[PDB]
Symmetry: D2
Subunit: 408 residues, 4 copies
Amino acid sequence: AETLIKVDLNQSPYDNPQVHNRWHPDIPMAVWVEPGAEFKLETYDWTGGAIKNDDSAEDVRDVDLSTVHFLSGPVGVKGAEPGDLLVVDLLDIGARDDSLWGFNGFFSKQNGGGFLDEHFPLAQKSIWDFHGMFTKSRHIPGVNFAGLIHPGLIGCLPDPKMLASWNERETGLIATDPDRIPGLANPPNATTAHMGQMQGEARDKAAAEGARTVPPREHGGNCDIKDLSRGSRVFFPVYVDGAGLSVGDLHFSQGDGEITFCGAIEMAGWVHMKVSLIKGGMAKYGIKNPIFKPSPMTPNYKDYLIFEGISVDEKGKQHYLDVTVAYRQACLNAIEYLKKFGYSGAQAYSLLGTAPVQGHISGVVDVPNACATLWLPTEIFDFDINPTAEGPQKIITGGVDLPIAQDK
Amino acid sequence: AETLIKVDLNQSPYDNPQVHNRWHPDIPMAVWVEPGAEFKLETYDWTGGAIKNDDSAEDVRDVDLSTVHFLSGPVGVKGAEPGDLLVVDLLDIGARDDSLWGFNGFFSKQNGGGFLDEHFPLAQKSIWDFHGMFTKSRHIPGVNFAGLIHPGLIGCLPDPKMLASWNERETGLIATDPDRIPGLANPPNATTAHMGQMQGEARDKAAAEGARTVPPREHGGNCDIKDLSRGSRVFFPVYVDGAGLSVGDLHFSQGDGEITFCGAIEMAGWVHMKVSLIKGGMAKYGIKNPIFKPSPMTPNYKDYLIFEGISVDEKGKQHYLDVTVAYRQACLNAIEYLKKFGYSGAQAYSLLGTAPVQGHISGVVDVPNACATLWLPTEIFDFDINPTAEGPQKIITGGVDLPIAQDK
Amino acid sequence: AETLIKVDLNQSPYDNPQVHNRWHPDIPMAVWVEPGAEFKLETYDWTGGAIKNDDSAEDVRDVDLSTVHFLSGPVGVKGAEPGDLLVVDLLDIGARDDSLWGFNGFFSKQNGGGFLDEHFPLAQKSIWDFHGMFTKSRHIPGVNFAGLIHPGLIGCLPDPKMLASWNERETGLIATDPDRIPGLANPPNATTAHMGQMQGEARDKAAAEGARTVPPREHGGNCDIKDLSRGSRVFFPVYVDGAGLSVGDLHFSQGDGEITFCGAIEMAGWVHMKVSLIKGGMAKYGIKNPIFKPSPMTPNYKDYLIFEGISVDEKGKQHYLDVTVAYRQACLNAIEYLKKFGYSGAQAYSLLGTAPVQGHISGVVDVPNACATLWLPTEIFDFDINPTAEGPQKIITGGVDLPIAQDK
Amino acid sequence: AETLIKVDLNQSPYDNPQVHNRWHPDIPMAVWVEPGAEFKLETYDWTGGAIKNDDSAEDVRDVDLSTVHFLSGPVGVKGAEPGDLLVVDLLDIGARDDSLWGFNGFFSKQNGGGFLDEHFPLAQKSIWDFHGMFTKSRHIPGVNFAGLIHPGLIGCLPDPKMLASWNERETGLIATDPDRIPGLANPPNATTAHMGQMQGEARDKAAAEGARTVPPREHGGNCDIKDLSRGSRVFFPVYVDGAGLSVGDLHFSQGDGEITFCGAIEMAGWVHMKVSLIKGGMAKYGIKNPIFKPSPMTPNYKDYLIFEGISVDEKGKQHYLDVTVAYRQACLNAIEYLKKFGYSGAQAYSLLGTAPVQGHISGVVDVPNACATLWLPTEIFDFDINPTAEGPQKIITGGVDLPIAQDK
Ligand SMILES: [Zn+2]
Ligand SMILES: [Zn+2]
Ligand SMILES: [Zn+2]
Ligand SMILES: [Zn+2]
Ligand SMILES: [Zn+2]
Ligand SMILES: [Zn+2]
Ligand SMILES: [Zn+2]
Ligand SMILES: [Zn+2]
């Protein structure tokens, strides 16, 4: 299939007019296609080159998070009207031949944070090499797995209404605690905005009101749903004429929650897709957020070891039906378990961000506690991590660990 | 294997000395077994007979929720010491031959509430019949599925310290909003307490400080994890000598979250299990909450239709990394979708509480929005519910709906 | 549901009028049901009590194979006419509460033979205990698995024409080598025939022309398809009015090919089923043999170690597209591999007949060799049997083995 | 990873010195690698360009089957000695970017034949297009599936002894019926032999004794095991120093048996692989034929409709434990079923050769009949093919069919 958007990794994303990093109804289509068209799009990694394949974490700590995410699009679809559904088949996804590695990290609390930032406040990095379908890290010994390759971010352009709501409610929330490190949301920011085929005046009004791509919203966008993977079929709400489908933020793999924030195994690559329409889909099927069907080709792991958490935090304080706090406990429990086998806490945390662990909302009614589970697939280890009568052999030798960078 | 605790459904649970409905370190063992023992335990449904197989919801409206849950146990295991892990193999689980039906319901907001109680505030009920491995409801046409049969509630007796913490933090939370309908937690309550073989003054003492079985806690207890099912192996923390393992609240099936609160498909039944020990297991493996391995025998549904939600509520107000609010959105999206096929909202809500739907914590870092997904297995419908170019057809037409009871 | 055919294991099968052990159009219905009826049938093990739970193989050696199989039925279905399809839902299947064990064996070559009878010519036995969904044998250490519970034999009564063809072609084949040990087929035999409710001369006429139940045929019958298991839906061709569905020969588990001949794990038990009709199904769907849909509840083993064979026998002699010889080599390769871990050959051969191993007709065109594969699920062993750089380790300490009985 | 053997589809395979089409101990290594090396090999389709993407079957009719299969290799592995096992990870496999289509056909009975050549004696062809992970044919409407991408042929060079045995037993078998159309085996043939880098005199001899690659043998070779797919790990017996691993005959998909003979969906492509050794692997693990582990990434089809056959042929003749005849019956039964939905017999036959259907050796003991099953995954049709009460609707219209060529 022909590649309709090409990416040169050594060219600055700002120099590519078919790339953009904010959501706005007025970004012009990077290309137009007919319904039924099938084609490939190439993509920068989300940072657009900021993070390197080496053994230092300073890049993770110093990255300018206002730049993310560099998306390829918007793709225009002829005849697409507001209120349609845009049916997207993800026919395949992969890494570029010249870039067979990816990265996971923990941001510093001072520059982004993450799910377990109170336990791992310093920036770190693991590097992942791709071996066909499989991946592994020089930083995490004894671990090998097939990737669940997915776009972290995909979705259609918002209408004027939608964008106004997003900015209002999100700036409103920053207003309630504007000095929290890390912040509660990210406001529009024109300084580092890439607005596609835009320069001058229209570029500068739109860049000042253009939404950050950081959070998932009603249209889809940055959902980081690992299961929205190569082979899947997704149904997107359409808000503007021609839809304006963009995609980026490709992951070779990811755990549920993407707890590390900085991936997932983040990568540059390509997406091969087919597009079509359901006329008036949104009203016909009562669509608000996207809906999709998962892939018939995914890694078949099923020998899970499953960890539990409840809505009582690390300090012993009682919350109310809080799935977020319950998941944190399940993740911490899994980390504690892994450490008994010789993994550092950073190796374990990176693992939960990268390997295809499951996070279930098992119970959300048994007041006051929600119950959340974290499913660790045991197939990914080249030794048996199941409990036995005699106790764990502390297998993991070496002195290998994830790079760590002191704060600035 | 022999049944070590027998249950007569027509006998009041209070008259059975091997049953109890509060957690307390001093409830004496209902029976003693050797490590390696295999045996069966019979169980009351969680209410102990309050809910009937008929077409009215008044029993659900009027049930005395202080009575739940009637558990079978505690089972003493010889040589079990605090800090051990109790290894339980769930070898099989089923319904009683004389009781081949179960119930799902929504509590009234005035008497219990639930996940979608703002949308369905009146008490309702669906009745499920068991056909070998399979189930269906006269109240929900076109739906048939294999059950994922599991105990909703299982775990070991707390020590004195643990119980004190539970009461302290939970009464503390009630104190912050004591008149809230429904309540934030349930305090100890001696009026409806069944304390097993406890007699005299010690009984009345213990009943006044005995914790409700309603929430999951560090020991396990009422987790309502559907995947802790027949065929699973679970590892419980031991707090007192002999462990004191109790089990109840059997489910023929359940969806992730148990959003309906009143099940799941609640039933009476039996559990066939084997028990063993890992000496000093808790410290060896860094165990706080239980861990387990899921069953090799589960329903193989994989053709999911997957719905999404973010941390923005039904009023449009913006929350911060709130998985609970995101899941509500995903569930409501699923319900809206099913309605287009002719299901009532009540049918849809009941379905999500009963069928083995998956609830994933897909993303919990993309500030401000968490992303939660609800996975509806399409194999359970006897017609195709997948989106087509044509839009849906109302294949659900006709009479039956769930019983509904007006508020007292 | 109600049990329409009851079985007393201590009663001779000949004394039960609702049992039979030959196929004949004139055996009267054991019971009549309406289409849509759901009910249970109890069953003798195929031999009807000949094999015992002990540590000697003499019963296997001496069994009278003319007696097999004692089937429960024929069940009549009101309105069923020749050329219909009888739709049978297998809703559940299990062992009797008073008989929680089963048996596998190798027949002596002198009395039955088997797939590897040139390698294991003496009669042997392994006994299997049922632990809820799971099984294991005191004769084969280190192995545990969830059973794939299925009827080895199920199908409808032949019409007069069909029965005549069966006898003609099968006696014709015996004629080509009548003194062969073991025989090529089994002729009608009135001596040990149980003809249900048939009386007098009519009974006598039928027992002399009644087909042995030993081989699978166009109607179904003794297929020993492990995947025709609890949870399946099967569609049977109907030849006579009322259909006359019979069932027996229940297996707790079996490997593809049932290579040991004497099971499988043979057992007495029960089948819970629902029946219905497709009017004129046979012509509508071009049905000759039965067709079916496998169960949504089966053991999820996927970590196979897969062995190969080609159409060259143990003497090195070249055959032509012979899948039978190819599968023998694949089984023999699997046995040789297992022996390196400390299993006897008999243990391994019993294992392949009992555990849910897969046998695939991988290639049947690459003249002169067919390619057959044997898939051994590695999850059934409590130690890792995968190849490593170091080679195997004799982990099966020994002492215990299958009973063996010298020839008479 | 780097491509160590490159292929120009427009260059004659005879002009590529790193390709060969006969098995012989003396073909020199096309390249040498160290143990632990990972690399790519590109491949011709098995015919090397003979079959074209068009709507006529004459190329299939006229192809010179003495030329097949053009393999890439032999790959030398430093330190590999006879009696070792060569561990091969298949890390990924795909189609070439310039060649995103493949072909299935039936050979004429006069030039190759096939499993159902008595029913389809004239040469035919279906063409398949690749859409990322998925495939479909302009010749078979209503069918879409994810490919189970595998090498049909892979293995190591035989030693002198092995080669002598192969020729002796195979020429011996041709001797028993030398004029048979099609032949029972294919003898060595120097006319169309490509012997890699072998030269002049030494080569003219090797080409006269070099075995055809057509059948699977002890070393592996052309097994056409669909499940030996991308993601798999295979363990090959080593016969000569450096091993000499070759590979070709790549399939995008195939059904069990490869009944159509001419594929499978045959294609040109590439294989990304890693190699390593088990020193003395063959004796350590009692290896005769290869063994392998299937892939964690395969198409997840589960909703099978399963067809049966027994050892009684199309003429009604009775065979003895003949799996080959039983499989033919099961395949013919499946074809008859599909025709009721509007497919031609040719469409159905091509489908069974290409789609990932399963063929099980379900029973091989119930004298006189073997029982074989054919498993059609129903997910591959864009309409429901399951039996219902009112019968099949003839969905397949149009007038498209496979090209057919009259005999030469
Ligand atoms: Zn993302
Ligand atoms: Zn990302
Ligand atoms: Zn519960
Ligand atoms: Zn419950
Ligand atoms: Zn049988
Ligand atoms: Zn049997
Ligand atoms: Zn081949
Ligand atoms: Zn091929």
